[PDB]
Every structure is written in C-alpha cells, then in structure tokens.
Amino acid sequence: KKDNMLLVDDAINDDNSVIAINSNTMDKLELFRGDTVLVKGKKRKDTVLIVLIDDELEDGACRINRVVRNNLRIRLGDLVTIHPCPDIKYATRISVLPIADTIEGITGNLFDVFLKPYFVEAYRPVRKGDHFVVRGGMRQVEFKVVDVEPEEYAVVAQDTIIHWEGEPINREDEENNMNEVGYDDIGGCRKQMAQIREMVELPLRHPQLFKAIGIKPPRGVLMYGPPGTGKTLMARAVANETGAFFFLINGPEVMSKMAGESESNLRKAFEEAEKNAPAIIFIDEIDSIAPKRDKTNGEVERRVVSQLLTLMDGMKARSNVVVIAATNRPNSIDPALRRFGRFDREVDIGIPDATGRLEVLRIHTKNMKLADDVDLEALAAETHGYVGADIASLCSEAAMQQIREKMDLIDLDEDEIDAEVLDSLGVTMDNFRFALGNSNPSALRETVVESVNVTWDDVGGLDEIKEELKETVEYPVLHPDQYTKFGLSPSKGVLFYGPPGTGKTLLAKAVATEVSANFISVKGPELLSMWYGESESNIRDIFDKARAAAPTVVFLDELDSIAKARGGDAGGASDRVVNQLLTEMDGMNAKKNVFVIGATNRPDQIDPAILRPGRLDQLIYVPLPDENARLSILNAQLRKTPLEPGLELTAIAKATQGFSGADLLYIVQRAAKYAIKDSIEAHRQHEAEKEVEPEVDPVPYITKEHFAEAMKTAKRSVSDAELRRYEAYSQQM
Amino acid sequence: NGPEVMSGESESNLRKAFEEAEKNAPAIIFIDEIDSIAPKRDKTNGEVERRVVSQLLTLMDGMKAR
Ligand SMILES: Nc1ncnc2c1ncn2[C@@H]1O[C@H](COP(=O)(O)OP(=O)(O)O)[C@@H](O)[C@H]1O
Ligand SMILES: Nc1ncnc2c1ncn2[C@@H]1O[C@H](COP(=O)(O)OP(=O)(O)O)[C@@H](O)[C@H]1O
Ligand code: BEF
Ligand code: BEF
Ligand SMILES: [Mg+2]
Ligand SMILES: [Mg+2]
Secondary structure, eight states, X not given: OOTTEEEEEOOSSOOSSOEEEOHHHHTTSOOOXXXXXXXXXXXXXXXXXXXXXXXXXXXXXXXXXHHHHHHTTOOTTOEEEEEEOXXXXXXXXXXXXXXXXXXXXXXXXXIIIIIHHHHTTTOOEEETTOEEEEEOSSSEEEEEEEEESSSSEEEOOTTSEEEEOOOOXXXXXXXXXXXXXXXXXXXXXXXXXXXXXXXXXXXXHOTHHHHHHTOOOOOOEEEESSSSSSHHHHHHHHHHSOXXXXXXXXXXXXXXXXXXXXXXXXXXXXXXHHHSSSOEEEEEOTTTTOOTTTSOOOSHHHHHHHHHHHHHHOOOTTTOOEEEEEOSOSSSOOTTTTSTTTSOEEEEOOOOOHHHHHHHHHHHGGGSOOOSSOOHHHHHHHOOSOOTTHHHHHHHHHHHHHHHHTTTTTTOOXXXXXXXXXXXXXXXXXXXXXXXXXXXXXSSSTTOOOOOOOOTTSSOSOHHHHHHHHHHHHHHHHOTHHHHHHTOOOOOEEEEESOSSSSHHHHHHHHHHSSSSOOEEEOSGGGOOSSSSHHHHHHHHHHHHHHHSSSOEEEEEOTTTTSBOOOOOSSSXXXXXXXXXXXXXXXXXXXXXXXXXEEOSOGGGBOTTTSSTTTSOOOEEOOOOOHHHHHHHHHHHTTTSOBOTTOOSHHHHHHOSSOOHHHHHHHHHHHHHHHHHHHHHHHHHHHHHHHOOOOSOSOOSBOHHHHHHHGGGOOOSSOHHHHHHHHHHHHHO | OOGGXXXXXXXXXXHHHHHHHHXXXXXXXXXXXXXXXXXXXXXXXXXXXXXXXXHXXXXXXXXXXX
16 A cells, blocks of 8 residues: 555645645655645546644545545545645746625625735645635635646746636536536446446557557447436546547437538547547437438438448547447447447446445435435335436435425425425435335336235235245245255246136236236237237337346236137237247346246137246146135125124135135125115115204114125126036146 | 448449459459348338349349350
C-alpha cells in the first residue's frame, strides 16, 4: 500500500482552500505548511489546497471542509489520491461567477464585498470548475471558477486579476446531473461492467499493451438484452468518466427534409469525432437505422446503411475511436453490420440475481430518510422477476404510498407548506409491502392475471398431493444447493389428469397466489391465429416473456387443443403448433428455470411426443375425494360463512359417496340461495307488518332445513363410464 | 458473398462479376452463402430477390464453351 492515498474526514480548519495532514504523515511524505497540493478524487475531478499540520488528523485520512469535499465529488469516508504540484504558479486572471440561487435578493458590487477580502493576501490555489463559498452580509454566496489563464489551476496573488461578471445562472445544477453518475451507480452487472471498462480504457489510453501481446483491440461493442437493464446508464457513465469528446447522435434523428444530406450528417459526425481527439461514439437505437435489409422497401435507408458501413470500415490505426450501440431486440440486426470488423464483442447484460437485486436496492434507496425496521434481504429474496427499472419504480411507489399515508391525518394544508411534517418522514416496511403487492414486472405487464384470493388452506383435501406439489415447485428456484448436491437434471414440466370438478384449476390458482414466484396463464386455443406465422409467433413471444422474467410458471390450460393427437388434415397448422411447442420446450437447460404446468380433462388425446420422458415426465393423478377429503372440502368451502353451531357435516360426508367438490359447492350454493330466499320473505313480511321488529337478519345462520332442502336435487357430476376410462388410463400409465 | 450484392444494380453487379470472370481468363468464381441470394423462391415474397434469382439463373445458363 502506497501511503499516498487517503480517506476524507471531517474538517477542523473551516477555511475553504485548505486540507489538514498529520505530522507523522509529513515525515512519511515530505510536505509543508505553505505547500500547495493537488487533490484528485473520483469522477475524474481535481482541486488544489494548502496542507497544514493537524494533530487530530491521524495519518491514514485527511480533513477537508465540505467545499473541497464537494468539488472532488466525494463524501466523508471516501478515498482520494493526494500529490503535490509546485509547477502551478501565480495567476494572470480569473473568471468567477455567482450561482443564481445564492444571490437571489441582493445586487451591486460582489467583488468589493465578497471576492476582494476572500482572495486578498491569501494567494489561494484555485482550479477551473471549482465552486467556493464566501460568507458575508448575512448570507453565503457561491461562485464557480469558469476560467483561468495559467492552465487548469493557478494561484491568486495580489497582482492576479479577478474578473467577476453578473451572470446568475441555473446551469450548475443541470451540469452536475449530466456529469453525475459514474460507475458506482450500476450494481449487479460486475462482469459486463469490467468488460465495458476494459473496452473503453485499454484501446483509448494505452494501446502499447495490445501492441506488446499482439491482439488487435476491437472498435465496436453491441449491447442487447431485456429493456430496462442499464445500457443507457453504462453509456452515461462512460461519457462522464472521461473528459474527451462525446458526439451523441441517435437513430431516427440523423434524417433531414432536404435532398439527401443524412450521409453528410453521418460524415460530419465522424469527422468531428476524428478532428478533436481519440474519442467515443454512442449511437442509440440502431434498429431504426439497420432494417436488417429484408423488410425495407426504400432507397434512402439503404443508402444510410451503406454510408454507415463505409464510415465504419474505413478506420485506420491512427484514428483510434470505438463505438457503442445500445439495442433493444437482438434479432432484427443486419448481418452485413454484424460482419467481422465492425461489431464483434456483444455483451449480454441479463437479469440480476438475488445478490444483484440487493446491490440495486442498496444503490437506489440509500439516499433517503428510510426507516428503522427495514431488511433489504427479504425484499430481494421475495422479488424474483424484476430488472433494472422496476426496483426504482418500487421505491417510487413506496415513497408515494408513504406520502399518501402521512397526508390524511396530519393535515398538510396544501395552500401553504409547513416545516413539521417534512422531517418526520420514513418509508417503513408497510409501504414497501404495499408497493410490492401493487406492482408487476415490466415484461409481464401485457399478460397480467387478475387476483384470485385463494390460499393453500382453501383447497380442501389432497394433502400429500399439494405438499409434494409445493415442494417440487419450491425446490429449484430458491435453494439450488440440494440440486447441486443431488447431481441430477430436474423435471421441467408437470401434468394434471382426472375427472372434471376435482381441483386442478384450483391448484393452479393456489400456485398463482401463494408460491412466491411469478405466474403467466394462457387459455387453450387463445394462441392461434388465421394468418401465416402468427400462430407460432404467439407461442414464441409468450415463451420469450417466460424466459425473460425468470423464474415463472406457464400454466398451459386444456392441452387437448394445443397438443392435439396427429392421426387428411386442414393444411398442417396444428402440426406446426406442436412442432413449435416441442422446439421451444426442448431448449430448457439448468438456466432460466421455468416450469410448464398442464391440466386436461381427457388424457387420451395428448401427444406422446409431448408426454415423452425428458420433455414432460411428471404425471400426478387427482382422484375422486374420499370420506375425509370430502369432509375437508365441506369444511374449506364453509370458511367465511356464518354457519350454525349445532350443525355437522359428517352426515353430508357419509350420505354422499361418489360426489365431487363442484356439486358439493352446488349444494352449498343452493342452501345459501334458500337462506337468501327465506331472508327476502322474512324482510317483506316485516315490511308488510310494519306498514300495516326482528334483528338485523331474521335468519343469521344457514339452518339444517336449508341443507336438507338443497340436497333434494343434488345430482352427481361424473358418470360411471368416465371413471372406468380414467381407471383404465391409470392402469395403463 | 451473398448479401453484398444489393444497393436496379444487383443485376448490374451480377453481370459485372460474370463478365469480369469471363473476360480475363478461364477462372473460378466463389459465391459464399448462397442462402441469402436464393431464398428458395416459394417462401419468399419480395421482388428484387426474384429478379436477382432470375438474373443468376439466366447468367449461369449463358456460359458457352469458350
Ligand atoms: N443495472 C442497474 N443498476 C442500477 N440502476 C439501474 C439499472 N438498470 C436500470 N437502472 C435504473 O433505471 C432507470 C432508467 O434506466 P435507463 O438507463 O434509462 O435504462 P436503459 O439502459 O434500459 O435505457 C434509472 O433510474 C437507472 O438508475
Ligand atoms: N378439492 C377441492 N377443495 C375445495 N374446493 C374444490 C375442490 N375441488 C373442486 N373445488 C371447487 O370446484 C370449483 C371449480 O373447480 P375447478 O378447479 O375449476 O375444477 P377442475 O378440477 O375441473 O379444473 C371451485 O369453486 C372450487 O372451490
Ligand atoms: F434496456 Be433499456 F430499456 F434501454
Ligand atoms: F377443469 Be375441470 F377438469 F372441469
Ligand atoms: Mg436506453
Ligand atoms: Mg380447469
């Protein structure tokens, strides 16, 4: 460890142009009380200050006031490199300007008042870009050094000419934001960030390493992946981490209404990137530029593609520029633009894992008065399919929920704002839980499923079936250590079969509500279209949305219409659907861990090519309920009902042997209908006896006579031959 | 190569390449990645692909003994 790098500490000396080192630091690095030292911090910024012996400092980190600390874009507890510069000498002239909001109210001679006594006889060591502070006249004004004559940094001796102007600006706040954000604001993408940093650092600063090894540096990088991942943030961080030129052009803004000058715009962009310095070019949204040369019909876009191909190929060794192109979809790319020489190093910035979600959480919400009872580990563990911007939307929705929560009771008084509510603001766990329950992933927005309030105790019976189901779904998405220690490839599909009215759709709803993962549901023949190619493109982009928001559950309901038996046809469309489903279901490796759930009524018409072991091997039979399962169904269907205390369901469980949950629900609904009819008759009788008093309801519970009248027309659902067919299929399989 | 023939100038490029290979010497032409030029003519729906396939057909057929 070279002792030339030190951390930022609080300031004892309240002066602007000063830093404090300890004496044991002075003997460790020769410097003095008058010595003017160059501080170079993060964000590629610098500053100049006077070193002074400080006993309290302790050699390891340095004291600097908040003004110096700001110019370096550092905080208390950040590292900076310190090194002396006496090459700097007395100024010829200086160019400071007051920031508008620090002078709103006053006017007149700022020089005589603030600047004159501030710089006098101190010969301060200033810098271009510095923003210093001067206290006087019952306020503190902030000026920004806009220009000096003696290079970037100089000293303000009494002979130095201080020029101030009355240009109150707003620009510094805007200037800080664009420069703001470097490489510490992007979390969860460490390998791609290191590769991008290498690709912008090594060919641009020192090509001697690549000349020594003998590998030609690439002059082009492509960024693809899901939307809202961080390609634009990476481009902004790369544009801010270097003070070189950054010619920013976009996709559809290179055109013009005159007779063919977009080629001249591309030529002038390339010549302005070539004229100044070895620089970097970021071309955003190249899908509007490259139409893949197949679905285009014009000549102007082909001339644009040819001009960009000629301007991308003709780069010599003395040019030394690289290009960055952000791209949403990775399939509509021109293979002539993907030729060897222009775009070769394609990075894959995918969805983050739990540690990446923790990194983006600790990046985003660390700039607020947050809470006192928060744990981000459970928030990152429960969240599965979010990527990049959805976490920021979650934090914004939590802040808006906190604002809605602390408004109706504390009386904000929207005509004029107070100062009592503003400091008592904390986004607690309840606002984050409400924001988690009131949001959705950005890839599953168009396939949003309406909320069905069912739990794992609402499905009466099927106890061992539901516990092995919740185990075999909860295993491969949260704890992969048992999967790694087992050493066997897992199942990537499951199927339900049995009589209708048994609980397959109810088990699918219980998966959709209480599995702590994502869920996407389609109907059977919904993914078919009369056009050509769309009937397979629907399955293709549905499975693309499934692979994007990993993990998820794709419930293919009623597979007797998609996976129809082949067996003279209508043209071969269902065969194309089955083949597309087979080639989109066979590309399931250990990554992206999706799960396909099927539930049919007739299992004889399912394709053996899709019932093959290795594609969809599991087969859970859901049989008819027994006595105890029927009692559990009758107890779970009567949960939120005002039942009679002197009423038992064991007689209903014993008197019905071949019944099912659907007709049991029909029995309970007919009993409720009879109770509602009795309530209506008692209400109209009470109205007649009042016009010509009981309780709030004359029938507060469902009596035994209502059940005895509802079970009078209680048929059964399934016949006898269907049970024989299902028993024959269960004996065959 | 295949998709480096486009910019009515694909037919001019095909005629230019064939007359250049016929003018100089008895030689050999390498056409790499023919699947872009020949889209199998039934699944395609464009018209400059049909025109450049017809041009390649009438230019490959028009080679004599000399
Ligand atoms: N990987 C990431 N890490 C941190 N913040 C991210 C990430 N991806 C996206 N964001 C956040 O998403 C918001 C907008 O992202 P943006 O750069 O516009 O997305 P993109 O690169 O897809 O165009 C910003 O608030 C940004 O901080
Ligand atoms: N085992 C069960 N426990 C509780 N309710 C059940 C059960 N089986 C069926 N039901 C009821 O049946 C109704 C519809 O059943 P559903 O799942 O759609 O049938 P299927 O098995 O044909 O897909 C729901 O109102 C549900 O409450
Ligand atoms: F990937 Be981002 F939405 F550009
Ligand atoms: F969905 Be069930 F099998 F009627
Ligand atoms: Mg973008
Ligand atoms: Mg169903």
